[PDB]
Symmetry: C3
Amino acid sequence: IAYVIGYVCVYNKGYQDTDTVLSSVTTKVKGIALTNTSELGERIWDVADYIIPPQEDGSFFVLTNMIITTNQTQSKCAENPTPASTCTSHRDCKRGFNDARGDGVRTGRCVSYSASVKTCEVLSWCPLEKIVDPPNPPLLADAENFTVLIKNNIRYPKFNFNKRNILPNINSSYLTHCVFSRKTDPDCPIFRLGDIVGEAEEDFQIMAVRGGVMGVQIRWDCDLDMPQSWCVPRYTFRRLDNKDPDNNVAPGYNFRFAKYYKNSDGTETRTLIKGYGIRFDVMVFGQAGKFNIIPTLLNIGAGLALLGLVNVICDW
Amino acid sequence: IAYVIGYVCVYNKGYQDTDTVLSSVTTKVKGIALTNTSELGERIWDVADYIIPPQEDGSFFVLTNMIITTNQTQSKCAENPTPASTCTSHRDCKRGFNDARGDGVRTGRCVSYSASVKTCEVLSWCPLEKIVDPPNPPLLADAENFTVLIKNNIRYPKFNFNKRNILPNINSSYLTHCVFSRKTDPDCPIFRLGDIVGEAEEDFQIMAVRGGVMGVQIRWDCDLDMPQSWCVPRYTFRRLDNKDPDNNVAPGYNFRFAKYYKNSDGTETRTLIKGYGIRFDVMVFGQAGKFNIIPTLLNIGAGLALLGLVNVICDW
Amino acid sequence: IAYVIGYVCVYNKGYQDTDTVLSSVTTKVKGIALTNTSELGERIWDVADYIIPPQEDGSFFVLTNMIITTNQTQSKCAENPTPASTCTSHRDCKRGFNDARGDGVRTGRCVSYSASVKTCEVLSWCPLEKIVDPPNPPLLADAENFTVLIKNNIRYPKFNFNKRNILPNINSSYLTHCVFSRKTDPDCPIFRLGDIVGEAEEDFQIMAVRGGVMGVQIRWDCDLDMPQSWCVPRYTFRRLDNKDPDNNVAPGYNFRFAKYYKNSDGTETRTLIKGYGIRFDVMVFGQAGKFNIIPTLLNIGAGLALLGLVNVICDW
Ligand SMILES: NS(=O)(=O)c1cc(NC(=O)Cc2ccccc2)ccc1Oc1cccc(Cl)c1
Ligand SMILES: NS(=O)(=O)c1cc(NC(=O)Cc2ccccc2)ccc1Oc1cccc(Cl)c1
Ligand SMILES: NS(=O)(=O)c1cc(NC(=O)Cc2ccccc2)ccc1Oc1cccc(Cl)c1
Ligand SMILES: *[C@@H]1O[C@H](CO)[C@@H](O)[C@H](O)[C@H]1NC(C)=O
Ligand SMILES: *[C@@H]1O[C@H](CO)[C@@H](O)[C@H](O)[C@H]1NC(C)=O
Ligand SMILES: *[C@@H]1O[C@H](CO)[C@@H](O)[C@H](O)[C@H]1NC(C)=O
C-alpha cells in the first residue's frame, strides 16, 4: 500500500526537518492620560510616567491605579491596628521581635495609635502606608486607549532564515496612522491596549482596579519549502493570572517602589508608591521545516516494513 | 548495501540523542567617557551614568546620544507648531480633545506660541521637549572604546552537563589585561563595543547618532561522545533593526525617562531625558547529543527495510 | 521477538509525540531587616529598599551588602594610590590619557593625594569611591530569613495545555501562613531565601559578603496520556557562579548605581552605591508528550525490520 505511506508522509510532515526560532522583541507605548483628584489636583501622565520600567525587552508595565504615601521618615512610631499588635500592657510587645506584617521591628514600650486602642511601637518609615482599598474607578482608566507598537525579528539558525513581522508590502505612510484590527487591518503591528484586553474576553475597566498579567503570544509557523510569502506570524492574547480569590495569593498585579528626597536639613525622606497595573508579556515561539532526503528515505523504509505486518494481518 | 546505511548513520547523526541548552548570562561594562558641550560644560560619565538599566541579565543598554529638557512643571501651556494645531479662532481648539502627538490635552482658549502663529493651550509639563535633531557627532562617541565582559553558564539537563565559557586553560592573570580578537585572542570573553559593531559590517560613529539594536549570539554545539575539550562556544554578532527608512516606523533605538525633583516651595519638577543608545541582545542557543542504542537500532532497521526498495528498483 | 520491540516502545517513549513548554513566572519577596552602624545609625529596610530592580519577571536581586560614597561633585580631583599613577614630576601625567582604572581622565598638572605621595589630577565625581573591602558580617544578613512566593504558569501549545504550579487541592487559608519544606510542605511555592541557598550546599552568611548568582530551576515533565493529577513541577537549585578565584574575573556579584540630587545652589550631586547581592535566576523548562498513531506504526515497522537482522545474526 504505497498510497497509504505516501499520504502518511504527506500529512504527518515526516519528510520535514524542523528547527526552532530565535527571536527579538521591541515594544513602544504611545498615549496620554489625565487624572483629576483632590490630592493631586489636575494632572497629566506622559510616556515617562505610566511605564515604570522605562524599557525592558520582552514585556512592559502600564500603571493604572496607585496609592501614594508622602514624606516618610525613619522613626519610632505607632502600628496599624491588628489583633496581634494590640496593647494591654507594656510587657505585651516583645523587644526586637519581627512580625509577619513587615511594617517594622517591635520595641519594648508601646504607644496609642488612637484614643480607643494602643499598638506596639516600631521602627519604620512613618507615616505608615494606610491600609485602604485602591480607588475605583482607576485613576488611569484613559490607559484603555493607549497604543503599543511591537516589532519582532526572528531567525532560524540551521536554515539561515531571517524575518521581521513588518511585511514588505506595508509602507511607513500606512504605518503612521494605522491601528490593528482583525477584520480590517490584520497586518498592522500597532495594537490598542483596550483591544488586547478585550480579545482575551476581559474588561479593561475592571482589570485596571487591581491589575493583572496578560500574555501576548506570536506564533511563527513557517514552511520553508514554500516561498517566504507564506511565512506570516499569528497573534493570540491570553490572561495569565487567576480570577478566583479562593485558590491564589494576593490576586491581581501590583508592586511597590520609592522616590528618595533629601531635605534642606539633610534628613532623607521617601515617597512610597504602590502601583497596580496590567503587565503585558510578549511570548514568541515557532518551528520551521525544510526538505531533507534522509528522513524521507528512513520513513519510507519503515512504512514498507510495516506493510509486512499489514500483509500478515490481512492473511489471517 | 550496509556501507550506505552506515555512512548515512555516521554523517546524519541518526545514532545521536539530542537535548537543548539552559543558559545564564552576566555582562559587565567597563569604560569612561568625556563630553564637552556648552550646556553641560565639561563632563565625565562613569559606569553608573551611561548604562540606564543598571543590571538586567541577558542584555544591556549603552547610552550614546541624548536630549535633555530641564525644569518641567505642570501647567497650562502653549503647543509646538503643527498644521493640526494652528489657531485661527478660539473655537478651533476642541475642549478636552486628545491629539495623536501626545504632548497634552487641549483646552478652550488658545494663545500664541510665537508672534507669527498661535497654537492651542495644553495641560502638560512645560517647557515642552523641543523638536530638534540629535547632536552630531554623538556626545558619547568615546563609547566606541568601552569593554564588556560576558560570563556564560550552560546546562544540558538530560545528560547532566554543566559548562562555562571561561575555559580552564585560562587564568585570571591573562584575563586581567585581555581583549577579544579573532586572530590573536579567540578565547577571551572581554569584547570591545567598537569591535562588536564592526564585526557586523557597521560603523559605530554613524549608528550611535540614532542608536540601533545589535544581537550577540553564542552557539553551544557540543558532541558529548567526544571529551569535553571539544565543547567550545562560537560567537557571532549581527544587526537586528532595519536601516531602511521607507518600511519601518521610528528608525533607530531610543527611549524617554525622567528624574523627579522637589523644589524648596514643595512644587514637583522633572527633567525629561530622551536617550538614543545601542542595545546589545545576548542570545544563547545550542543542541548537544549523546550516543544511544535504541535510535541506532531503529535507523539500522529502517535502512535495511529501504534496501528492499533499492533491490526492487535495481531489478527493473 | 515482538516482546522485545514492545518493551522498547514502552520504555523508550517511542510512541510518544513531544512538545516544549511556554512559561511565565512572577516572584514576590516579603521580609524586613534592621541595620545598626555608625554612619547610618539605626536603619530599617523595607520591600522597596533591598530589591534594586523593583520588579523584573524571571529573576530578582536581593541586596545584602553595600558601599556608599555620598555627596559626589564633578570637579578636578586627586587620584587613588596606584603604581601607574604616582607622580615624580609634572611631565609624568599625560594630558587627556585614559587609564584602565576608569576613575577619570588625566590632566597636565598633578597634586598630592597625601603628604607622602602625589598622583595625577583627574576630572571626576569626588570624593572618589574609597578602595576598601565590604563590611563583614554583611549589613543585610537578616535577608537570610526573607520569603519569596513564586507563581508559575505554563502552556503547551500543540496539545492546548494550561497549568499553574499552585495545585487545586491547595487553598488560600493554607497559603497565608505556609512555608516550603521538602519533608512537610512539598506543594508550597513560598520558599525561604536561607533554605534556597542552603539546599544548594552553600552558606548564606559567607556568600552574602560578596554575593553570587543562584539559579532556581523548575521542571515541568508531564505525561498527558495519564490524567493531569500527575503533571507536577519539580524544584531544583544550583549555584551558578564560580567560587575559585584563580580562573574567573571579579568573583562574586555586584553592581553600581547612583541617586541624583540637586542642591539649593543648583549644582548637581550624586550618591554612588556599590551593592553586592544574591541574584536568583528562575529557569523553567520541560517537555510533555501525548499519544500518536503514526510514530507508533513507524517504530513498529522499523523494529520488525531489525528483527530480520536479528534472525540473520542468530542463523550464524
Ligand atoms: N518612567 S520612570 O522614569 O522609570 C519612573 C516613573 C515613575 N512614575 C511616577 O512618578 C508617577 C507619579 C507622579 C507624580 C506623583 C506620584 C507618582 C516613578 C519613578 C520612575 O523612575 C523609575 C525608574 C526605574 C524603576 C522605578 Cl520603580 C522607577
Ligand atoms: N545608571 S542609573 O542609576 O540606572 C541612571 C542613569 C541616568 N543617566 C543620567 O542621568 C545621565 C545624565 C546626567 C546628567 C545630566 C543629564 C543626563 C539617569 C537615571 C538613572 O537611574 C535610573 C534607574 C532606573 C531606570 C532609569 Cl530610566 C534610570
Ligand atoms: N526599590 S527601588 O525603587 O528600585 C531603589 C532602591 C534603592 N536602594 C537604596 O536606596 C538603599 C539605600 C537606602 C538609604 C541609603 C543608601 C542606600 C535605591 C534606588 C532605587 O530606585 C531604583 C530604581 C531602578 C533602578 C535602580 Cl539602580 C534604583
Ligand atoms: C477612548 O476613546 C474613545 C473615542 O476616542 C472614547 O469614546 C472613550 O471614552 C475613550 N476611553 C476612555 C477610557 O476615556
Ligand atoms: C579609542 O582609542 C584609540 C586608541 O586608544 C583612539 O585612537 C581612538 O580615537 C579612541 N576612540 C575615540 C572615539 O576616541
Ligand atoms: C532568622 O530567624 C530565626 C528564628 O526566627 C533566628 O533564630 C535567626 O537568628 C534569624 N536569622 C538572622 C540572620 O537573624
